[PDB]
């Protein structure tokens, strides 16, 4: 199908307890493959999936060098922002950044992203044309002006339309078994009675990959959202995911309710009934 590769950077300041901390992680789809941690002893980019381990020493050295320069900048960027926003040094603050690219089933560029957040709120983002930026407030306008003069957009464009796309394709090939599978959800339904008048139906999906999935309830074939609960999709720890949806129904009416499971590993959506 389609595929994506993202890097997620998190920088945090620790006033009164030390210098900032920078953590980077890299994903292909819902599978993590690298990490870097400025607090850790190794000070190298580390493998986090079997299929990246085969990359050679210059791969690891160049990735380490690149992420170390970002680590150093973003750790300094915390002091910059605290000055733009006139924040007291008493406060602990956060810079986040996501960037990466999607490709279609032909392996070719669809879309690329670069988005930054300061304390969980949008700061600056690269627009879809990869040539201009959207600043969120007057502080991020300072950064926008700096980046537009120095022409930093087209370096992002080159990376996002070239190197990102091309190594995503390499990783997709090297980790064929892991990354290009669809593990169909294994489903079942539980039932929990607390009293005589009311029972909870729970629809389960286990062992599925990719993470994208939809569970919906129906009564008599009609959609039903009243009295339903849906938990966050959650990792099993073995590369698959889990999810459930539940509904409270009056006793005796269980038979009318259907759970519906849509996942790209299922040729036809599943239908389950108590």
């Amino acid at each position: 199908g389609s595929h994506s590769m993202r890097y997620f950077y998190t920088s945090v300041s620790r006033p009164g307890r030390g210098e900032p901390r920078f953590i980077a992680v890299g994903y292909v789809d819902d599978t993590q493959f690298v990490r870097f941690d400025s607090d850790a002893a190794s000070q190298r980019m580390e493998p986090r999936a079997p299929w990246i381990e085969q990359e050679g020493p210059e791969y690891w050295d160049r990735n380490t060098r690149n992420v170390k320069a970002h680590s150093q900048t973003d750790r300094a960027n915390l002091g910059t922002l605290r000055g733009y926003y006139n924040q007291s040094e008493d406060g602990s603050h956060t810079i986040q950044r996501m960037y990466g690219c999607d490709v279609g089933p032909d392996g070719r560029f669809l879309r690329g992203y670069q988005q930054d957040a300061y304390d969980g709120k949008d700061y600056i983002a690269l627009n879809e044309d990869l040539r201009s930026w959207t600043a969120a407030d007057m502080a991020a306008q300072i950064t926008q002006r700096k980046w537009e003069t120095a022409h930093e957009a087209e370096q992002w464009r080159a990376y996002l339309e070239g190197r990102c796309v091309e190594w995503l394709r390499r990783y997709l090939e090297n980790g064929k078994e892991t990354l290009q599978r669809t593990d169909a959800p294994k489903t079942h339904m539980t039932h929990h009675a607390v009293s005589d008048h009311e029972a909870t139906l729970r629809c389960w999906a286990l062992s599925f990959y990719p993470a994208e999935i939809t569970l919906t309830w129906q009564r008599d074939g009609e959609d039903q959202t009243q009295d339903t609960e849906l938990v966050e999709t959650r990792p099993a720890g073995d590369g698959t995911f889990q999810k459930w949806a539940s509904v409270v129904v009056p006793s005796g009416q269980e038979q009318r309710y259907t759970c519906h499971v849509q996942h790209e590993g299922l040729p036809k959506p599943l239908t389950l009934r108590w």
């Binding site: 890097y7 160049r62 690149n66 960027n77 990102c164």
Partner: peptide, 9 residues
């Protein structure tokens, strides 16, 4: 592959 881009604020 990590990008070699600039991100100073």
């Amino acid at each position: 592959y990590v990008a070699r881009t600039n991100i100073y604020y």
